[PDB]
């Protein structure tokens, strides 16, 4: 009596018609804020070029390709690069560029699969390892604890730190969740990657069960009239984020914490919007 | 009072995570059945080379790309090929094809791109048009009347016939609905163009709207003791419509040839073929 | 990743705050159809009541009572009537109509009670049985076949057919269901029970699975400007109707059919909206 | 192309069928619970007695029937009452009580009738107003704030203190959100006016936008013949002083304001900290 009927399943697809929700409003304001990247910060270039000078790093994994924007930089930097997202959608305009620049010896040469951070250890050969595996952009907040226990986070860790050689590099980033939480408020345009060309309000989420955070959902709203789009977020604090990304090394590492591209001591004035955990492979 | 939260917009993505549903059994099911497409049967593959040949095409257009397979064959056979999709989940399939054999130069002019029949005019620059278009593999009918007066059919012919230079080519088929709708069934594992090698169930649901036949949806069963199975909705367009509709897409002014199962089709022949494939050829 | 969640479960309420969509355009347009009943045919009470007082009939189990109109008649003209419902949305309206005329004795002798077809052998005392059962309105093709082998509709007549005691009388009937299906078109205002005070178009869907028919959707439109609303039903023939009636009874009855209260022979010129099935029971 | 097909419009019923996930666990369960209320505390009775006799009132207007055990315990006291709910499917179980006792004259003349706070000075003819209009269980944080303003919240107080007769009273209660936002925690089977007999494990969800709190979501679960089924409901997080303030606005400050906390007067600093929070207005007149 109550049951409802589907033209066709969740997730399939066929010849000459768009995709579920493919051309929807909110996929259509969504696909402007993640193209907003054409303004990549000098800052942001600068240190995790620098970085990876600095360690002589020359084979590089970056485990949350996206759009491929870190990745495209470090291919025309000279690096070999191996790109590698969950997600068809966003893989798709990486893809796209290295084909329209599939005629530079640099982008024939680099790589980009599917692969999940839970399933990474099948999903990419690492060989010895990686000199640097590269997780920015807030993407590791994206995996939500479905579970209740943070297993899932602990395993996608596990598995992202078993791509890093001995004596290699994972550089990995949340957004300052510690100050989010307390003021309840995601400001926005504070993007240090990228700086924005395109104008938002937020409305900000926060879901707390037994005492505990849970989640943060921003409700994006863009001009026309207006329209919106929604994306959500585990909010990791950088005392529990700290212990996890150690234990994925199983304490086998060096580990050190930025606050925007700086070295961050507790309790000092400046408060990031980011912090990145930059950890070297003891072992 | 009643409200649901998403975690995350209809449509959307974000990196690390996999799309919607994308993982679901129904999807892993689905493609199973799009991938099976190994064995392209000699007799199609005979059959297109030739008409093609005849009519001396080069520059070729394929509006329902899907996974490639159709545009692949052409490519091999030295074709200037241009195919399209509205979908990128099946588009990802032909580029991925594409990228793996790039170092034949065929393939490195292969011309893979998104575009909608009721946009085509738009998203494709047609210049003075192809040589032939393909619709083939009974795609057209993937898209539904979502108004009652068949007006996005209508739209939809009229993008893809502008598409075809003056003298030029437009193939276009459909599954026999007429046989489907007369007898309630669509039996599975006929498709004439690749020989299945997936074993499937179908249950096959017509729904008529005021005496009009408006969907047939088919829900497909596999096993590995086991028994997923996934659905797709399709429309379902009977000879005598498709013919009128075809034609007018073209103003009247064009020869119409209708095949059945690739060899011609004389209405109240013995066989029933699965399939009618329409040949256009503009005038010009 | 995909998950939704709920201000509150499905069917569950709560003091100060409307039940879930009883507000909604749908259920407004829909209160307007259900209300559409104070003309009640000359010819429907003339033949129910001149059926009753034949057969003796003074218990009688209306076993469909939605709003009570059928119900109420019954106990105007002074027969002890009982009658049951599976839905509570409908049940408020006789419950209602009980209260208003409560003062009335033989309204305050109405007994009124949630039962399902389904479970009706444990919902109602029945005892030796009731005189006359009646399932009028078309109301038994709102039972679906989910489960695929018209299992749910055996049960459902065979405990409706266990109330009626031996010598007693059900009275049953559906749509013409056999046009229907040959022409696609199920035509609005041809309700021969009550005469319909109010204007509708109606869009007829019918589903057929494997090539046997399954639903009939009716999606109606009504001015009041257009507000929509959709039920559902199960199109029985007249044949395999028939047969599952009597099966209902083992066999052991009495069967005649009716077409829009006048006896019915197959190939008659006349084609009926409904068939009403009269039954004797023979032990 | 993703559109879907129902069966039946959502809202909409059918003779012979059961209504929409009429017959679901969650709503089996949540029948439970609604149920749990065969032991009405005396503290309570005593309560709402004695301050109803004290004001003189014999006009009674509860507002929150659901099942009507409110009503029930005034109708049998000799009250005068009139009650309303928005809910059919609570009130269904107010009006099966009052026919059940429809031969004790009391009963006879209770009055139960849908109506909503939004549109309360519609749905019920006031006349002059009521002696007292109660208001109790925690029902108004039923209400959520759908518009971001508050402003749905103050309509329906505004309605509710209108139906009160100059120098009548309002009595109306919220649990102690200040505690429940405060630790994150709604203890279970706290209930102050009908003592538990079904025991539950709450998971406390509370939803902040913006910084300002939202919404409080509880997941009950409930045993069963031993196996486990959930049912859930939303609140709005009213903290006393925001709903002291609303509930003062609603009469155009023309009124007498005291809160009660667990039925004894509340002292702000107090040691004991109430479950509940109950307003008590009278309306200057």
């Known amino acids: ?14 010849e000459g018609i768009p995709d579920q929700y493919a051309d929807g409003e909110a996929a259509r304001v969504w696909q402007l804020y993640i193209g907003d990247t054409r303004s990549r910060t000098a800052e942001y270039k600068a240190w995790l070029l620098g970085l990876l000078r600095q360690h002589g790093c020359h084979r590089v994994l970056d485990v949350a390709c996206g759009t491929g924007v870190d990745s495209i930089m470090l291919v025309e930097e000279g690096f070999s690069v191996t790109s590698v997202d969950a997600s068809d959608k966003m893989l798709k305009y990486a893809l796209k560029e290295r084909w329209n620049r599939r005629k530079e010896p640099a982008f024939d040469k680099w790589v980009i699969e599917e692969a999940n951070w839970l399933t990474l250890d099948k999903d990419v050969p690492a060989g010895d390892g990686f000199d640097a595996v590269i997780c920015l952009g807030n993407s590791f907040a994206h995996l939500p604890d479905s579970k209740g226990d943070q297993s899932e986070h602990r395993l996608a860790l596990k598995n992202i730190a078993s791509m890093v050689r001995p004596g290699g590099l994972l550089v990995i980033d949340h957004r300052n969740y510690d100050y989010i939480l307390s003021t309840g408020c995601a400001p926005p345009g504070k993007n240090i990657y990228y700086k924005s060309d395109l104008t938002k309000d937020i409305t900000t989420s926060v879901l707390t069960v037994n005492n505990k955070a849970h ?13 919106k789009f929604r994306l959500s977020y585990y909010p990791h604090c950088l005392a529990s984020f700290t212990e996890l990304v150690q234990e994925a090394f199983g304490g086998r590492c060096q580990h050190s ?7 961050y001591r507790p309790g000092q004035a400046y408060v990031p919007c980011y912090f990145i955990h930059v950890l070297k492979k003891t072992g």
């Not at 914490?257 to 070295?263: N, T």
């Open 257 to 263: 914490v930025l606050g925007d591209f700086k070295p």
């Open 215 to 227: 989640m943060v959902t921003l409700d994006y709203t863009v001009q026309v009239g207006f329209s």
């Open 1 to 14: 009596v109550d049951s409802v009927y589907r033209t066709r399943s969740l997730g399939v697809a066929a």
